[PDB]
Design a binder for this molecule. Structure first.
Ligand SMILES: Oc1ccc(Br)cc1
Ligand SMILES: Oc1ccc(Br)cc1
Ligand SMILES: [Fe+3]
Ligand SMILES: [Fe+3]
Ligand SMILES: [Fe+3]
Ligand SMILES: [Fe+3]
Lengths: 388, 166, 510, 388, 510
């Protein structure tokens, strides 16, 4: 029927009359602010905090918890649902963390959705504008379809590296950020593939298969070292914090930033390739997005913890060193790629200037925060020892 | 003076404050877990606070172990000096050798009471946890319902105090 | 130079080949099963497309909430009883959605196939969206409702009451603690397939009946994401159907999963529906029978029969204990009203007639008790009467199942009345059924959850409330109430004057 | 009060029951499709068509109109509100046009908004990533600031050229497309200024004032003929179709495409500039979107009109010849910019090849559609004379 | 190396420099005014930011329409009379919005200062937005309402009736035909400022009171855009004040614009409000007095006095001719009901009281007329009676103002009873007031609109209705009806029985 058969309390005369009669003259409490008991990180409490902080049911025996008592059901053996036992780091409150971008699910998928929609429009514009014509065939078929492509498994690996954290994080605010950090990473891996899939439609013989880029990753020598570092961060570390830290405040900051920025973002143009850059632009926007969160958790919160400041820095300094070497190594093996570049593409003066950038930025944004005194010259020197 | 803040809790915070030796603290933790955690605890006198106490002890042990160990050790050596990888691989052996769920059960619970971080490093601990737990489950979920309740109660060794079923 | 682009499906085609082999490439969590490394996922999604489809939904949802619904004052024109009910439904479900995040994370870590991981991942993000959605419902009713207390601080005030303990069991710990596959069955194979999915639609139905248009706007939006979670649970069973351990362990973890979930939701949900509303949609017994027997126990489980899955052996036992469970539970919930973070109401005349009509024999038992309590002044602050007193006077102990945390009263219940009490290494344990008892016997170390009587033992009632912030803004009036009217609200003082001290009921056996 | 003072017919018991009582048992007509009488371009009528076609109250005496009679109030002298007299082109129905992208207002601002928010996200990541460091200082201060900066006036002039069409277009579908082609042009001009403004923030000494770019536009040589063409297209053309057609199917299709794609996008990369290409990607996406619309209106509807095909092609050919000369002059003077670049940037062969790309695309996408006889080597030869 | 970006205002600071000088840089339209070369705009916007703020509004609007409102069946639960009102209100407004697109295009061309061009530009896009929003209301009511006819094809069925002609004067040709400044007065300084802005809000009130939540959702969104349009109309006055010609022509153009707008909206709006609703909000007379006299004639106009602006000299007459104008018109509107694309209703008993109370003497005049037509069976299809017939029998000719297109019956109207008939170069012309007459006498060539009687002369009523598709989808039932009930709807054949033939009333004059 036109009116339907289901009567609704908001519009049905009979039912609404009864409801309206039961209503009090005024709200039974003037405090209409949900999450009012939360300690604001900024001026006034934000929607982000209200909808997120304390969603995790931790009891007081987990720094910050507001509940009490043990869990109702545990693992065979007695292992707690969540416990202080899943990470070396200690804190006065696990709910202190705050994503500087204040990202809860809605704003997050809104931003990524815009990017997805624009991306589409862009590819349709690129293909129609024939901008492919000014693209170097070698770079296209060898450096983008093999070396760039293979790099996707690097990101994919860093992605999976977040699985344990997604399960073990000790707070909502930290769990949401971790989830987003890993989700952006797989996004990049899928974007690296998206391009190869695009090129496949505009370039007659281009093969989209991952066979070639995968082999370069699995058995190649350019990334070999890098892959070993990934496998370690992903499947050898059982500490959610160590994994997040080492991956974002060490590996990806050094190796990742170089490979993406100081290599393809700086050379793809030189071969008449504005396409690939369209995507690295996203990966770098994402990277910089994740970095603000990584900084707020490990430094503002943990590193400067009013009770375990020194303890945490010690552990993070320890972790820094632990993975700084495999990172250096990962780089060294990568340097062997420049040799495959046509003569004149670039020289050692540049490669040195770029490396020092990645390293200096690394020291400026991460190292100095935990007092991990590092030698810029030695590092560059060490990696540089990988050139032809 | 009750749920989150009470006399007994204050008493233990002052008892951990007098601890200034990785050895002494690592010991008090081990002994604390034996006295008040898991179904095999020595007594339930601190049942409402042991979870909070145990953590306040882990913190003291964690801070010390950090200022007492070195890069390589903090990552591979327990607070007792033991070699992490050693124990892990050893305990898994006993487990894979366990005759039945009753044996497996004790080894797993026991493993936790002794090696729970800050004692053993987190990385090895949770790795055993995935291995120990896997075996414990396999033995337990095998023919889960065959044993009647009357008998099961006997196997567990529980003292039945009352039963009613219409 | 024709306009060209690439869609999700075209990129997903190569997703499976994203993962590569090597030594330590295995899950970090204890499990008895072996998930296939060739397992595929139903929806060929990539991060960006996922975000778009979810964003499109948010737009609709939030647009309705911020515009038309606010202009219609939808946050207010809701029945008082339902405003209270949503404090529990939304916040309780919120924690379920929230632990689901960790669960699917643990699941994502379990799968070895790239597609299976990707599927779980999509849920990881869904559960995050659901956590924030349920949070938005309480956020909205707090901002524009007739009573913010509870909606505004449930994340801490829920810790006072006993009903919350059981929720954590089925929607928190049950979701993440134990064999990954066991957690999956609790979450997707039972919880979501048997309860949550049908539940969320049901909730929107009762909400509309009681004037609540906000919850339908949000929950129906959550519902659109369920088809994907259904697929994950189904695929979890598929990924282990070839493994030898399956035929040896599956049915056991499943039955345990079934009993765990129904044990709580059978009485709790029915209670929320029938006792938390004015206008009824359908008798809970009719609903339960349909959901549990037909849809799930029949159609859903039936399709998994080809993978070794069988009907939970504890099924017939559940239907037996079900009939009066929710009615039996509300008696205890109302009697312990001061421990909640919401206001409860006693059945009015129309409702008592409705209850008797659909549950012959309801009035002579429950009906008479309520009219007795009301005549004695349980609603009036100056009576000095809290129904828990009536239980003590008539020697009707209320116990907490050591396993499910569900409160039960053997001497008064019209439903299950079995009681098993044991002592082991200095601690007493109370059990309400044969299944929960076995779980504890075999896995003593998995269930050591302290109950409210143990933690509150010796404490005077008002001290606990105040300590846990069970108060409204004026620092005096209680959040919880025994009526839903605007006048004569109970204060911390009205409770202190009674001088009620908690006692551990199990000690009577000493 | 909690309930408010105003009573609403949808929720107020008393008022709603009065409403419900007067309702018919079912709809008084089962045809619930607004615009059902519009001839669909595609399989089924689109929301874009329903909401747009016939919004313009044209009488039957303006091809395709459904109303009757003269306008109610005309201009002093007698000029009609809208009339055939405002353009040389003729057709059987001014409402046949269809934006292939089916853009009505909501979809239009939705996409532009996504582009806006992502742009802001991109810049913040660009500055935080410190990519400006590797940009050649000369390209930055000379070519982006002055020359790319001067081009904003070109785009701005083209935006303005649409002002009369916004007022005179003979149908809603044409008016909506014209407005959007025009709006996208001022957006680009503003994005050019936004980049200059952005550079002023992360580059010490960079002056965002428009003084220099403007002086380059009003008095320089490089853009002299371009300015003369823009001034004419905008202010010496009173025919709304000659304006749109000549701007998009002639001037912007040749000069615009050359400057944006064959100069700035092609060369920016060689100077470590990924910033300018980000904005040019937007400009080119907009250009390709506009082209689809320009082709439908002038080729699919007017150039192929069943009754006025020959006539319309004659006129458009006339216009192509008229504006091709000034457009070649604009390209010719622009060739002067190449001499200003650092030696070794590009050579005569590259310049020529890039001109042929622009001229060849123009032939295929525009000239050939109305049988205009274009000699590609003759166009290129005339332009090359501008090389110093 | 800190995260940085750039906003709209930062780019807008230099937008005024975008325009440059050259001999032919001048407006392409005739005008007596010279807009100041350095005039500025109130809002520092750029295309990107404009798009964003509008998109955000669209999300909420369409969000509410597609979700909650649709689920509430809000498209149906509206009073029948109001569903009909919105067919005219929304589609007629749609054309004002549409012609405002062209109007502001013309202003943006007139403006020489980049900032004043950009202000108008922003309106050009808002007007397209508003055209599509109005279309959407008709679109939504057609898809989900109780009577789609009219809502689904107003763009062609509107051409049958006489009320449409006047609309195209004040909201179409009046917006784009003449001196750009004159058009600006009709549109902005008078149209929006005096009638549409207060009108849009008024409509949402009347709508809400009659169960319509669709119109408020869309129209409240439209209203948030009118801040910028008010600034445009204001800067138009400022950009010409310092011009010698402004003192000579401004007040004359303003007066004509005022009368134009008023002449049509005074009777039409009030008619739509009071006769197109069940539940009343306020008597049109008091609403008018506030808008026209207080809020506009005093507050708004006074502010611009400094620029040479004065109060409209025809204001006195406008007020004198206001009070009964709308009542005078509904008599004609109902009498000619077969020429509409909507269904009309006779005032009911409850309404007649309301009318008499608020307009003493309303019953002795109109009340009796309607009661008679009712007795003649104007509502019944078998009666063979149509109100028009009553005007013929009683020698009450209906004329059409050559200028405003407003239909009038001088011998029966309680408002202006004036009539001026002239012969010029072989054509007859009829006017209803001294202002419209002056306009035609001085500007003959601007007003040659042929009227319905002139175009329909000698034509049988059913033939015209059929030719212009004034029928429902069944191909026989008329779209227009003399009553708003669900049964007994007149058909084309019921009108052909009648055998009514149009005649030009002016042909009687010798
Ligand atoms: O409205 C209700 C709120 C909570 C419970 Br428990 C029951 C009913
Ligand atoms: O509801 C109505 C529709 C049109 C007119 Br005219 C009057 C009233
Ligand atoms: Fe969910
Ligand atoms: Fe789910
Ligand atoms: Fe408007
Ligand atoms: Fe406007």
């Amino acid at each position: 029927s036109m009116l339907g058969e289901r009567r609704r309390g908001l519009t049905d005369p009979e039912m609404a009359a009864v409801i309206l009669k039961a209503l009090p003259e005024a709200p039974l409490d003037g405090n209409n602010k949900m999450g009012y008991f939360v300690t604001p990180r900024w001026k006034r409490l934000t929607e982000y905090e209200a909808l997120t902080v304390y969603a995790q049911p931790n009891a007081d025996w987990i720094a910050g918890g507001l509940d009490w008592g043990d869990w109702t059901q545990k693992f065979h053996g007695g292992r707690p649902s969540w416990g202080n036992e899943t990470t070396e780091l200690r804190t006065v409150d696990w709910f202190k963390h705050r994503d500087p971008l204040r990202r809860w699910h809605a704003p997050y998928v809104k931003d990524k959705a815009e990017e997805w929609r624009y991306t589409d429009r862009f590819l349709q514009g690129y293909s129609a504008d024939g901008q492919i014509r000014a693209m170097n065939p070698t770079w296209r078929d060898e450096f983008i379809n093999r070396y760039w492509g293979a790099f996707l498994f690097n990101e994919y690996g860093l992605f999976n590296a977040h699985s344990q954290g997604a399960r073990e994080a000790l707070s909502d605010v930290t769990r949401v950020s971790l989830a987003f950090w890993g989700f952006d990473k797989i996004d990049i891996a899928q974007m690296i593939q998206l391009e190869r899939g695009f090129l496949a439609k505009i370039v007659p013989g281009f093969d989209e298969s991952t066979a070639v880029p995968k082999a370069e990753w699995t058995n190649g020598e350019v990334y070999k070292s890098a892959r070993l570092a990934v496998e370690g961060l992903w499947q050898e570390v059982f500490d959610w914090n160590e994994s997040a830290f080492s991956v974002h405040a060490v590996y990806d900051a050094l190796f990742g930033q170089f490979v993406r920025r100081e290599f393809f973002q700086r050379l793809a143009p030189r071969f008449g390739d504005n396409l690939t850059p369209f995507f690295i632009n996203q990966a770098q926007t994402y990277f910089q997005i994740a970095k603000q969160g990584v900084q707020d958790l490990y430094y503002n919160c943990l590193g400067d913890d009013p009770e375990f400041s020194d303890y945490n820095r010690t552990v993070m300094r320890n972790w820094t060193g632990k993975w700084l070497e495999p990172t250096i190594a990962a780089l060294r093996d990568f340097m062997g790629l420049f040799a495959k570049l046509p003569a004149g593409t670039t020289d050692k003066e540049e490669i040195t200037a770029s490396l020092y950038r990645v390293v200096d930025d690394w020291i400026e944004d991460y190292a100095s925060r935990i007092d991990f005194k590092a030698d810029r010259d030695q590092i560059v020197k060490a990696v540089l020892a990988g050139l032809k | 003076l009750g749920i989150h803040s009470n006399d007994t809790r204050d008493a233990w915070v002052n008892k951990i404050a007098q601890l200034n030796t990785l050895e002494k603290a690592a010991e008090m933790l081990k002994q604390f877990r034996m006295d008040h955690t898991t179904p095999f605890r020595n007594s339930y006198e601190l049942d409402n606070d042991y979870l909070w106490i145990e953590a306040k002890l882990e913190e003291k042990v964690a801070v010390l172990k950090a200022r007492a160990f070195n890069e390589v050790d903090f990552r591979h050596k327990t607070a007792f000096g033991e070699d992490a990888k050693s124990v892990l691989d050893g305990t898994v052996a006993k487990m894979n050798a366990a005759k039945d769920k009753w044996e497996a059960e004790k080894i797993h619970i026991g493993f936790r009471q002794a090696y729970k971080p800050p004692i053993m490093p987190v990385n090895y601990f949770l790795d055993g946890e995935r291995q120990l737990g896997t075996r414990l489950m396999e033995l337990r979920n095998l023919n889960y319902y065959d044993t009647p309740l009357e008998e099961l109660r006997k196997q567990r060794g529980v003292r039945v105090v009352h039963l009613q079923s219409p | 130079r024709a306009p060209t682009s690439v869609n999700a499906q075209e990129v997903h085609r190569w997703l499976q080949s994203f993962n590569w082999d090597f030594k330590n490439n295995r899950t970090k969590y204890a499990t008895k099963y072996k998930m296939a490394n060739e397992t595929k996922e139903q929806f060929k999604l990539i991060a960006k497309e996922y975000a778009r489809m979810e964003a499109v939904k948010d737009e609709r949802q939030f647009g309705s909430l911020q515009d038309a619904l606010t202009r219609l004052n939808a946050g207010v024109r809701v029945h008082p009883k339902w405003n209270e009910t949503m404090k529990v439904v939304s916040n309780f479900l919120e924690v379920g959605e929230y632990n689901a995040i960790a669960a699917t994370g643990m699941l994502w870590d379990s799968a070895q196939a790239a597609e299976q991981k990707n599927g779980y991942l999509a849920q990881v993000l869904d559960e995050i969206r659901h956590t924030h959605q349920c949070a938005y419902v309480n956020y909205y009713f707090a901002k524009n409702g007739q009573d913010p207390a509870g909606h505004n601080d449930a994340r801490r005030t829920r810790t006072i009451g006993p009903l919350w303990k059981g929720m954590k069991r089925v929607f928190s710990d049950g979701f993440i603690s134990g064999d990954a596959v066991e957690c999956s069955l609790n979450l997707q194979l039972v919880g979501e397939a048997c309860f949550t999915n049908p539940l969320i639609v049901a909730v929107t139905e009762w909400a509309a009946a009681n004037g609540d248009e906000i919850t339908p706007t949000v929950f129906l939006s959550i519902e659109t994401d369920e088809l994907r979670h259904m697929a994950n649970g189904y695929q979890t069973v598929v990924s282990i159907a070839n493994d030898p351990a399956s035929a040896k362990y599956l049915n056991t973890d499943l039955n345990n999963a079934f009993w765990t979930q129904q044990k709580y939701f059978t009485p709790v949900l029915g209670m929320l529906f029938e006792y938390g509303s004015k206008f009824k949609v359908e008798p809970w017994v009719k609903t339960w029978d349909r959901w549990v027997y037909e849809d799930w126990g029949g159609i859903w489980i039936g399709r998994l029969g080809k993978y070794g899955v069988e009907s939970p052996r504890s099924l017939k036992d559940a239907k037996q204990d079900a009939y009066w469970a929710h009615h039996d539970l509300y008696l205890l919930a109302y009697a312990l009203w001061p421990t909640g973070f919401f206001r409860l109401a006693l059945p009015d005349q129309e409702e008592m007639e409705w209850f008797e009509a659909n549950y012959p024999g309801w009035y002579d038992h429950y009906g008479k008790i309520y009219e007795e309590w009301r005549a004695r002044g349980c609603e009036d602050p100056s009576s000095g009467f809290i129904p828990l007193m009536w239980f003590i006077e008539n020697n009707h102990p209320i116990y907490i199942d050591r396993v499910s945390q569900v409160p039960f009263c053997p001497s008064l219940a019209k439903g299950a009345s079995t009681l098993r009490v044991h002592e082991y290494n200095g601690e007493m344990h109370t059990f309400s059924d044969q299944w929960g008892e076995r779980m504890w016997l075999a896995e003593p170390e998995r269930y050591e959850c302290q109950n409210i009587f143990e933690q509150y033992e010796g404490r005077e009632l008002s001290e606990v409330i105040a300590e846990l912030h069970g108060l409204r803004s004026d620092g005096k009036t209680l959040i919880a109430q025994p009526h839903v009217r605007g006048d004569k609200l109970w204060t911390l003082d009205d409770i202190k004057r009674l001088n009620c001290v908690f006692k551990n009921p199990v000690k009577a056996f000493n």
